[PDB]
C-alpha cells in the first residue's frame, strides 16, 4: 500500500538485480504516471522506449481487450488467423520480404545472430563454426549469455561464466575499424544500434550508417540494425537509420512495437536471409501469438495515424535547444535525436545524476541516469509542446537548484 | 637560415609525414631550446620523454665524445669490450637476468612480441602460430606494420595494408576485460604502458597494475610493460610500475636511455623467457654497439646521481596543483605522474589546443597537443622549482589570454 | 678486461641471440681493429657494410663532436635547423624528390612497405587490405615480425608466431617468375636487393635489374631497391643498381649512411609516392634528429671526396681474381662486386667456414661465414692495394694450411 511498504516487500521477496529510483507507480496514462500517494509525474523514460504511444493508449488497449475474449495462444504447432495479417502489415510497412516474430528484444537479437550464422554457412560458404559477428563497443542488446558476451560493460558480463565465441568487438562510430574488421572472410554480420541508448545516447557522426552499409555490402557481410530502442518514431523517423536512407540487411524491432502492453519483438529481412532457417530450426512458445499480434498492429497504427515521428522530430529540437541553455559547469553535453535525448552531468563533490533524478522526481519528473553522470530524457511521443515546455522548466529549476 | 626558410626547405625535400609546431630550433641545453632567431624557450615536451636528463647533458656528451675516438661499431659478428659492461649495469639496476639491446622503441616492442611468441610455443606449449598477444586500446608503441596492427587509432593503421594476425585488443584500465581475454589458453602475453602517453597521458586507476600482474601470473601469461616513455624517472620512479611494486615479466626501455644522444633501446627479462631465442634468431646491426652503450651507461648514471626521480615526483605535484587552479570552462582536466602530465582544453568556437600551443610558443614555452584537445606538459627532469614556477606562469597567462 | 672475461660477462648478462666469432675488439681505425690484448686485425666484414668509410673516420667523428655540443634531439614535434639541409643534400645526390628519415635498416624497409601499401590503395586503387608486396627468396631486411614474414630462412621466422599477410615470395634472379607474379593487379610493389648479402652475396645475372624495372613499370608496380648493404660505394657505384642504369621507384639506404657512428636510415622516392603518407601517419622518435643528420652528411661527403666507389670497383677485381687462384677442392666459388665479395668453402670431414674464420682470425684477418660454407670478404672501402694484397696473402696461407 505505501511506497516504502512496496519497496520493503520487493526487497524481501524479489531478487536484487535492480536498484530503481525510489518511486512506486500504480497508474499511467499518456505522458503521465501516478504513484501510490496520488502524486502525478511526467514520464521522461518511456519504459526505455517501450511506451512511445503513451501509457495505456486506448486504441492499443481496445485491441488487447477484443482479442483476449477470442484467443490468446495456440502455439506455433497450429495456425491462428491473426499472425498472417500482422506479418503482411509489418513487412509492407517496413518493406522487407518476411518477419520472424518473437517476444523480447534479446530474442530478436538471438534470432538475428542465428540468421547471420546460418546464412554465413549455407549462403556465404563460411566453414562450419568459424563464422563471426562484429559488434560495436558500448552495445547493449539484452541479458542472455550471448548478449553479455558482446558487451564491453563489466556490469553485464563480469562473473557470468565462459563467454560465447565468435563475437568480435570494434569501437563504435569508426568506419576504419569496421573496414579493418571486415577483412576476415569469416565475418557473417555486423550488428549496430543507429544510436546507442544504454551507452548514453551516443549518436554516431553523420555518414556513419552510410559507411557501414557500403562496407558491409562490399564485403558480403550482413548489416544488422538493432532498432529495438531507436525505431518506431522514437528518433523522429520510422527507423533511426532512415535519417541516412540506409537499408540494413536485418532490422530488429521490439519495445514500442506493442505500446508496452505485451512483449512483442520482430526481426525483418528478405528471403535470401530469412529462409536459411528451415521448419523446426527456430522458434518460441509465445512468438507470433494472436494477442500480441493484435496489439502490435494497433501500436503500429497509432504511430502512423498520430504522426508521432514528425512530432518527435519537431519537439526533440526544442528539448535539446532549451537544454543547451543550461550552464556548462552543470550540463557538459546535450545529445539525441527525436525524443531520445540525454544530458551529461558534471559530477562534482556534492551533486551527481542520481541526486538530480531524485530531486527531479520531487519536482514531478521521472528520469534515470544511464552511466552515473548521464541522464536520459525520453518522454512519450504523444507529448505536446506546452507539456514539453512545462517539463523543460521542471528540469531547469531542478538543475539550477544545486 | 631563417625559420620560414627551414620550414620551406623541409617541405620541399622531406616527406610530409609530420606537421610540427612552427618553431625551428638550433640549440638546446638542459630545459631550454633556442630557435634560429635566438629566441629561448622552455622545453615542455622533452622530445617525447627522450631528454629526461635535459638537452646535451655534459656527462652523457662526454661519454659519447670519449668513445667515438675509440670504436663505434663492430657489429654483433664480433664482441666489443663495452656491451657486457653495460649489460651487467642495466640488468642489476633493474634486477633482471638479461637484457636484449636494440636501437629504437618499436624494435624493443617487436623483440618483446617475438620473445612472447617464442616463449608461448617453446615453453607454454601453444600450438604453432596460434599464439596471441593482447594490447589495450589507445596503445602506441611505434610505426612498424606490427605496431600499427595493435593500434585503435585510424591515423596509424588506415591505409596500411593487411594487418598482423594474433593481436587482440581490450579496453585500457579494465581488469574484468583482461581476465575475460586471458581465458584463451593461446594468449602468450599482455603488453601495456603503465600510463598511456600518446593516448593523452591516461593514468589507470590505482590497483590496475597489481591486477594485471595477478591476472597474468594466474593464467601463465607474460606481463610486458612498455616503459619506453614512462620509465627512467619520468613519472617519479625508475619505472612507473614501481608505484604499485609490480614486477612485469618483460620491461621495455628506450628514449631517455641515451639522454637523446643516440637511439638506444632495451628489453629486460629473466632467463626462462630471454633464452627462448637462440643464437642467430634475432638481432640488429646497431643493437648493442660500443658508442650507444657508453651513452646509455652515462644517461642512467645521471638519473641516479642527480636523483631525478624524486625531483620529478616533487615538482609534478606542484605542476598539477597549479594547473588545477585554472578555470574549468578552460581546462576540463589535469592529469599525470611525475613530469608526465597533460591538460584537456575545452575546444570551443575560437580556441583549441594547437592555438594554445602556438601562443604558448609565443610566450616562450614549447609544447604540443596529443589529440586535438589534449596538451602534454613534460619538461626535462632537471628542471628546478623556480624554473617550473616561471613556466607555470607562462602557461597561466597564455591560458587566460583567450 | 680479458677476451674470455668479456665473453663470460656477455654470456651472463646478455641475451644469447648471437654466437659471434670469439674476438673481443676495443678499438678500430680505418681498415683495422684491435682486441683487448692489443692484437691488430684487418676488418673484412666492415660491420656488415656499415663502416664503408673505415672505423672512426676523422671527418665523420668531427661532425658528431661539433653537433653534440649544440643539439641532439628535439623530436619531430618541432623543427631543427639541420634536417632540411641533409634532406636537400641526399635528395639531390640520389636524384629523388624527397627522403623519409628513419634510424635502422628494418625501419626503412617497413616505411617502404607502408609507402607501397598506402600508394597501392590511394593511387593505384587496390581495394583496402588486398595489396601485396612481392619479395625474392633469400631476402634479408631485418628482424621485425614483418621482415621475418618475407623470409625463406627458418632461422628468422621459425617460432615467431603468425606471420604478416600480403607478402608473396618468388625465386631471386628470375624474370619469368616476377612477370608471373605481377599478373595479380593487387601487387603494389616488389622489394629486391641488387645483390643479396646475407643469402651469401648472390649476384643476379646481368640484365636482371633492367628486367625488374621493365616488368614493374609495365604492371604499375613499385620497384623497391634495398640498397641498405649494397649501396654507398660498397659494390663500386653509389648504388649497385647503377651498374645497369636502373632507377628504382624507392631506394632504401642505411648502415654506411653514418659511417657506423649513428643509426641513420633513409627511404628515397618521388612525390607521387612519398606524399601518399599524410602528416601524423608515420614517424619515429629519433628519425631525422640533428646529430644523425650531421654524421650522415659527413659520411656521404667522405664517400664522394675520397672517390671510394671507384676504389671499391678497382680493388674488388683484384680481390676476386686472386681468390679465384685458390684450389677448387678448397674454394668452390668466388663472387661479388666492388668490395662486397664471398667465397664458398667446400665443407668436408675436417674443415668448414667457421674453422677457416677462426684460423683467419689467428692470422690477423676478421671475417664471418654467412651460411656455414660461405665466407664474406668486405673490407672498408678506404683500403689500399698493398693492404689488400697483404690481407689476400693472409687469406691464401690460412686457406692453404688445412
Ligand atoms: C538496443 C536494445 N536492443 C535490445 C534490448 C533488449 O530488450 P529486452 O530483452 O526486451 O529488454 C535492449 C534493452 N533495453 C534496456 C533494457 C533495460 C532493462 O533490462 O531493464 C534497461 C535499459 C535498456 C536495447 O536497448
Ligand atoms: C610508449 C612508447 N613505446 C614505444 C614508442 C616507440 O619508440 P620509437 O621507435 O623510438 O619512436 C613510443 C613512441 N613515442 C612517440 C613517438 C612519436 C613519433 O613517432 O614521432 C610521437 C609521439 C610519441 C612510445 O610512446
Ligand atoms: C640488405 C639488408 N637490409 C636491411 C638490413 C637490416 O638493417 P638493420 O639496421 O640491421 O635493422 C640488413 C641487415 N644486415 C645484417 C647482416 C647480418 C647480421 C645482421 C644483424 O646482426 O642483425 C644484420 C640487410 O642485410
Curated annotation (Swiss-Prot), chains A, B, C:
NCBIfam families: Orn_aminotrans
Record PTM N6-(pyridoxal phosphate)lysine, positions in chain: 255
Described function: Catalyzes the reversible interconversion of L-ornithine and 2-oxoglutarate to L-glutamate semialdehyde and L-glutamate.
Name of the protein described by the UniProt record: Ornithine aminotransferase, mitochondrial
Species annotation: Homo sapiens (Human)
Outcome, altering residue 399 to N: In HOGA; loss of protein stability; loss of ornithine aminotransferase activity
Catalytic reactions of this protein: L-ornithine + 2-oxoglutarate = L-glutamate 5-semialdehyde + L-glutamate
Top class in the EC scheme: transferase
UniProt effect for mutating residue 208 to C: In HOGA; no effect on protein abundance
Any one biological process term the GO annotation gives: L-proline biosynthetic process
Effect in UniProt of substituting residue 365 to P: In HOGA; may affect protein stability; loss of ornithine aminotransferase activity
InterPro entries in alphabetical order: Aminotrans_3, Aminotrans_3_PPA_site, Class-III_PLP-dep_AT, Orn_aminotrans, PyrdxlP-dep_Trfase, PyrdxlP-dep_Trfase_major, PyrdxlP-dep_Trfase_small
Signal peptide: none
Quaternary organization: Homohexamer.
UniProt keyword annotations, A-Z: Acetylation, Aminotransferase, Disease variant, Mitochondrion, Pyridoxal phosphate, Transferase, Transit peptide
Major location category of this protein: mitochondrion
Outcome of substituting residue 143 to T: In HOGA; no effect on protein abundance; loss of ornithine aminotransferase activity
Effect of residue 56 to F: In HOGA; no effect on protein abundance
